[PDB]
Design an enzyme around this catalytic site. Structure first.
Site, short mmCIF file in Angstrom:
data_model
loop_
_atom_site.label_atom_id
_atom_site.label_comp_id
_atom_site.label_asym_id
_atom_site.label_seq_id
_atom_site.Cartn_x
_atom_site.Cartn_y
_atom_site.Cartn_z
CG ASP A 102 -1.73 1.60 1.37
OD1 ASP A 102 -2.12 2.18 0.43
OD2 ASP A 102 -2.98 0.76 1.86
CB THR A 142 -6.05 0.19 -7.07
OG1 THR A 142 -6.82 0.99 -8.37
CG2 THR A 142 -6.41 -0.97 -7.36
CB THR A 143 -1.93 3.64 -5.13
OG1 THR A 143 -1.23 2.49 -5.71
CG2 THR A 143 -2.31 3.21 -3.20
CG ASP A 159 -6.28 -2.28 1.79
OD1 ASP A 159 -5.88 -0.84 2.62
OD2 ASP A 159 -5.65 -2.98 1.82
#
Lengths: 492, 490, 496, 489, 74
Positions: free
Chosen positions: D53, D86-87, D355
């Site tokens: 992350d 998702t980043t 998450d």
């Protein structure tokens, strides 16, 4: 030319260089004809340390700036559940990085290549039991107990002229080990003097402590006493002195073992009686001794007579070629036994304290696993022939990941041949032809310089080393290859 | 360690580095996806030169300390009798050095390894003509004249948008010049004016000159006079001798290779004769073969010792520049191609490509054999050679297998310069060739595999046989010579 | 302590850097409110050379190590088949390099993108035949003689206020000139004064020289003599000098000689003679004017004093010294040949009036083919906005790879409207969107009116661009600049 | 003071450099083809740490002088009350800075360009509004609850081989808390001890504490007592506590601080279970669950206290002892609880449940999602390009620059797939133009395919937060006036 | 040249050197006309011990980097 500052490409190289540097030192250690090395360091070091086992040296020293120490630390966990034999797991991981050179040429997402590890799993299915192998030890077993993998573990080790005999002795220790309750109660002490046999097998327990200079030399029909509590106005002290003797004369006590400090007054008394006592005996040895002696219920001075059970074959201090120790023998139980090792003679000689611990584990697995594979590179060439086919027949993406994995196996046959001193290239052509034929028994014979029958030599590898190396080889690397090289800071 | 004195293993490495550095620059110049490069130097270089052709730039400069200049010098001898096409021989020679890393493992003597090179001869012979070379190119030839090998030569040159059309034109030029026994009478001038056609074909020889501003514009039933000696040299006697001989012949045009004397010039204008001053000698020599020739000497030159062609001599505007056309040569053996083009560095680029387009086509007519381009030939040979290593006894087998391995990189190099993943390309490529289709190859535009023949890309048969045996002998001398010691020249 | 050290991505930068450096100097020049720059160099250079025309300056100087000279050479061929107008071909090529920063982000194969260049072959050709609307010019042409393209060429020039009038004058020069004869013997100069006209039309060729204070004011049915060689008992020798004088007067009279022009120093004795006779001579006449003059007069054979009569061919109409407002100059005029003609502009020693001479050579080229082409397109950027609206559609139309390269070409046209307006002294942002709406609507005539501050009718103003300049610029530029980005890296190695 | 004073172009540049450094590291981390990363750093880190992350690593370390740390700080607020998956929020924000080089050519002032943001709303709103993407999320829903976005969040992370199932459990937790806004009272713990499913669901809150060796193991019809003040003449304190306790029938005592020894003897005999130094975060969340109470001095018991009397007990579920609070009358707040196998991977499960939890609560309530794999982004690009031509004077410059920015996103996804993006970029464009919102980049396919079949959907919140935050940061630094001192601290 | 860096084959030489270095001191002792060596050591040693018995002196001290201590012990 030159330049040190890491981003993009430079990032892979620091990891890449660390893997190649370690491979050359460890490569010599592989198989029947390995080599011994010595190292010298300033911090917390007395003199050059020579360890045959690759794992022991890597844990001990963090020599320089490049990243590789963390990879090294993990190998210990493997050691506890299997570990040693020959150091090969680090080598395979290092060679994985070598085709990364081809990756720049690939010019695609490096991470996509990670699917290759999944591909490797497909390779793993193919890899599993496709390479005949050896069925392995049934349990205890006659001939197959040794003259196998332990000798191979030893082969790198500098003692194999007579050492292989020592190894042969070790399986006897493992067979007795099973049944009582996994692995504990195993202790061996090396001797500073040489003999043709180079090792003695004890039917009891080996210890090294003495009450004092005075006391009779040997005891018979021995009674063993173990006390939890130490022996530790002055007239009142005499009462403690007298209670000890009064109970003692009646039993016939030949030896007293206490796990802790022993009070001085009784010591004077023991010498006149003819009883040998041990001050501050280690608890781990004592507890083991109890299994061996039938056990005791340890409490206050009431402990003597019936609540105490003592084996009586014989307890004595025996001169062993130089440094003398106390031998406990003839245990009624028979379940727990002790091995006394005699060494080649050198600094290497003291490793015997924890060397046996490494030695017990390889033999224990051979008897316990009931499966094995053929030695001197036999396993590696056969698998390589099969894997080449696999990449060619899987179209597109599937083909590239499997082919790269396949060439990695080719180097192992050469590493064994090169340490042999015979020509690696001549060896490669002849080797492949015998494996291709289908004789899994045939393998690399270093002594011959040519290919021969491995089974006749008796060199075989245990089943555990091959399955486990393959499962996490492709799992440890994937977390690392997901990444290129490290995040923000201005390292090194 | 680290400071320029080299012996045995350290000596080999310098040769190794030189070979790898050259391959990366040349790789981008292979097949339809090839590229142009520009190099700048100081000290007797004038400035920046662009060279599509790898051979021209390599010969010109010996840039640095590593040794490779001598290897480079050799490619030119090849060039006159075949040369160009596409530059692939240097790449193959360079890749032979990579196997030497495996060689250290061999650890004894590399020299018995050389026996591998004669083993290589079997591999060389075995797959280049083993697919389907082709059958034809018997003489002049209708459709099969181009849209083949010239395009491939051009393929390495990006300009092949308008340019591939230019390539098609060149075979027309080779049909008249066919034989390559004697290459001479070909002159090409680029012209500074853009057009879709980009080039014009002249039925004769093209030259830029004028007598002066006087004299007739055009001549027919022309007689041509060429003089070795100048008109430069009682004066009136020189004038009359020239006129008396001239009038009887009916002299339509006079060409002299040097300075011309003024008195004659007045005479020529009234007579109706066109003369050329300081015409270049090389054009003249070509012209002689073309017009049946003449013997050039002093003023006894006219009449029979001189032979003159009878079709048409005139000055015709070309684009934006005024040129003179010699045409209708009786011989027919020699003629001229005139380039036009958009006009830029690239138009000057065509000068570099002329002496490349002309050679490849000449060879194609003579060999009467060809191979499929786009890497089709290379993958097939690799599949066949792998089997051979296994067949042979042992040491020979080790050397034979390594040669086979090198062919794998070529599929990768074509895809790498193309624009698609090299890894993906290799797997799909091998299956096509393995299947048995000779035509199938690498389609860079597609990104996958396809039919090479549709594109019209073929490689001369001669380039492929010569590369294989010659490479073996050249590689053999370098492994054999271990000690190379040198110091700076002066 | 120095070095060039560059690898892989930095190599790409060298092609990139050359394009950006050139664009800033040239951008000021483009459009109606252009900027003039003077360049001075020493060492095989004289002084103060300032060129309004971008093409002339790039060809002359190769300043440094980075590659760019070859790109420059291409523009001259374009100039030969049509010329100038305003310089813009170089600017569009430069901006194509900016997308390459995006290409590293692309991170696949930059060469794959190069396929777009192949595409540009189609992109450039749809650019052709399609676009701007106009018609033709017959010959000589009353109203349509000018008030067209010359104003456009001039628009880049700081000149267009009084000067658009000067521009109008230039086609008169082309009408006398017209044919396929060449561009020959066209001479124009400048003079130190200020008048609304700011220029005058001379009948034929301008020269700044005089025989002396004495001599006839003007000559008619003039014979012109050009000589390569100069005019340059003890008492009898002095008498002998008179003999040189005798030959010069006696055979001069038979010819009727009205003017003598010599490229060098002239001996004093003959000078007295010319004044009394009625013949005007020129001392130290410039050779360049003379060779050009000879084409005009039919020429002559210039040798020794035998030169007069038949070997000499003088043209006769009017040769006189005339008032140019301030100082006085001599006009040859009345040439029989008609091939060569001349006009005069006014300014001299202003500061940059010599830039006018540089400005002048490109401006003349524009007018000469305006009559020959007979075709033009609307000016003031009217043509450019229309094509830009059309090209956005095209990128979508081409599949995959092709669209990325075609779309970049389309934005190139957008900058021109902005450059025209920006130098004007009006806000660039407001101008672009208002402009697009008018072209989108369907009116070709509508364009950028700088004086207006908004959009207006281009046709009324009298601004047009040659049809030839727009057709050629689209074809040659794409294919020629194609070469520049087909190559990602330009290098070599090291010196020391 | 510090006094680092920013001037025109040298102010803009610092923002520009920060954005480029972040984009390369975060780009490989995205979706199914997401990857783990390790970091070694100066100072006190002494080793390489690996966090899949992106947000966790950025807060831990502030490496250098330009300030990107504040931009970084903002992402956590997103992560706790929505967040991850998702980043991509940081990546999109960074790409818009590149265009500013183009902007100097425009050369008026940044603020005129700022008009793009009003139109960021009009161009983008059309983009999110180009529709399909979200099935609809009826409310609770039998199977669309998961096997979608939570699974993909896990995909970039290795634990997904058996943890895809864990993700499935998390949606159940969000559905029961729907209404009145969002997230409050959600917590997760993991226990050492293996099971194939690797989880146990508790209808109440999980706390890890015990009163002492003695005390009743199970309590029934439990009353809950919460004290702001600790238990710490002495006998009189003992007497007050006992008298009040018996009448209420008090079965459990929870105190957020140190507990005094004297009462402890009484609790065992009484039949009351007490907790020493109970965590405040559990208590406040618990209070919503039990209806809460006003915690004062020992006068606190009975009516001023409100306890929930369903079932409280300490349960041996494997190895480590835990206490289970169960029976929430309110229904608004619940927990979840997790089990494992006894692996490094199991501890990773703890990393991703958070998450999974955040995504679904927002996904259900917002009633919106977008198509992943760049489906939404390419379609957005097609709609925006025509828009620039449509807008007038000041409107037609800002919007046009924003529109080409969207083009890069399709390209980034195709490369991480491994196939040539050049072919991919417009082949992709043709499909979106046609009208299939469901179509987009298929990394597994290598070309383009149907995104909906894949099941990748992105929360509507992840997409709005990224686009607005992207250039607001760009415009604020360039403007900066009279900057004071230095360093975010 | 210029450095003490050693690997593989050069590495063998240090083992080689240790055997030659020990032999020169011992050879004088080996017979009927030996010399006599004293050996004073600074740091945790009690007086200098002068020994004619070769076995006694080799065992007592591990003097330097080269390895010969292990040969000595036997």
């Amino acid at each position: 030319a030159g330049a040190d500052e890491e981003r993009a490409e430079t990032a892979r190289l620091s990891s890449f260089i660390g893997a190649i540097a370690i491979g050359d030192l460890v490569k010599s250690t592989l198989g029947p004809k390995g080599m011994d090395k010595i190292l010298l360091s300033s911090g917390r070091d007395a003199s050059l340390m020579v360890t045959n086992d690759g794992a022991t040296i890597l844990k001990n020293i963090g020599v320089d700036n490049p990243a590789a120490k963390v990879l090294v630390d993990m190998s210990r966990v493997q050691d506890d559940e299997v570990g040693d034999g020959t150091t090969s797991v680090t080598v395979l991981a290092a060679e994985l990085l070598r085709e990364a050179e081809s990756l720049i040429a690939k010019k695609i997402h490096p991470q996509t290549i990670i699917a290759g590890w999944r591909e490797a799993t497909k390779a793993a299915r193919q890899a599993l039991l496709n390479s005949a192998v050896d069925h392995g030890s049934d349990e205890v077993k006659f001939r197959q107990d040794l003259m196998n993998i332990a000798g191979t573990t030893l082969s790198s080790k500098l003692l194999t002229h007579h050492k292989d005999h020592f190894t042969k002795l070790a399986v006897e220790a493992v067979l007795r080990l099973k049944g009582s309750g996994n692995l504990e109660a195993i202790h061996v002490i090396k001797k500073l003097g040489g003999s043709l046999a180079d090792s003695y097998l004890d039917e009891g327990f080996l210890l090294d402590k003495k009450i004092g200079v005075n006391q009779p030399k040997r005891i018979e029909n021995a009674k063993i006493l173990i006390a939890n509590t130490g022996m530790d106005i002055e007239h009142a002290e005499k009462e403690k002195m007298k209670e000890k003797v009064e109970r003692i004369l009646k039993h016939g006590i030949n030896c007293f073992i206490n796990r802790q400090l022993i009070y001085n007054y009784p010591e004077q008394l023991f010498g006149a009686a003819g009883v040998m006592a041990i001050e501050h005996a280690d608890f781990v040895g004592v507890e083991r001794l109890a299994l061996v002696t039938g056990g005791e219920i340890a409490s206050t001075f009431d402990h003597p007579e019936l609540v105490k059970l003592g084996s009586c074959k014989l307890i004595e201090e025996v001169m062993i070629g130089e440094d003398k120790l106390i031998h406990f023998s003839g245990v009624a139980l028979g379940e727990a036994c002790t091995i006394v090792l005699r060494g080649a003679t050198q600094q290497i000689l003291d490793e015997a304290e924890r060397s046996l611990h490494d030695a017990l584990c390889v033999l224990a697995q051979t008897v316990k696993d009931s499966r094995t594979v053929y030695g001197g590179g036999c396993s590696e060439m056969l698998m390589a022939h099969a894997v080449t086919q696999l990449a060619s027949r899987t179209p597109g993406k599937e083909a590239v990941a499997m082919e790269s994995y396949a060439k990695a196996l080719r180097m192992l046959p050469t590493i064994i041949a090169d340490n042999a001193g015979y020509d690696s290239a001549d060896l490669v052509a002849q080797l492949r032809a015998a494996h291709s034929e289908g004789k899994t028994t045939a393998g690399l014979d270093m002594k011959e310089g040519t290919i021969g029958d491995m089974s006749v030599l008796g060199i075989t590898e245990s089943f555990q080393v091959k399955r486990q190396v393959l499962l996490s080889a492709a799992e440890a690397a994937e977390v690392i290859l997901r990444v290129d090289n490290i995040i923000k800071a201005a390292p090194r």
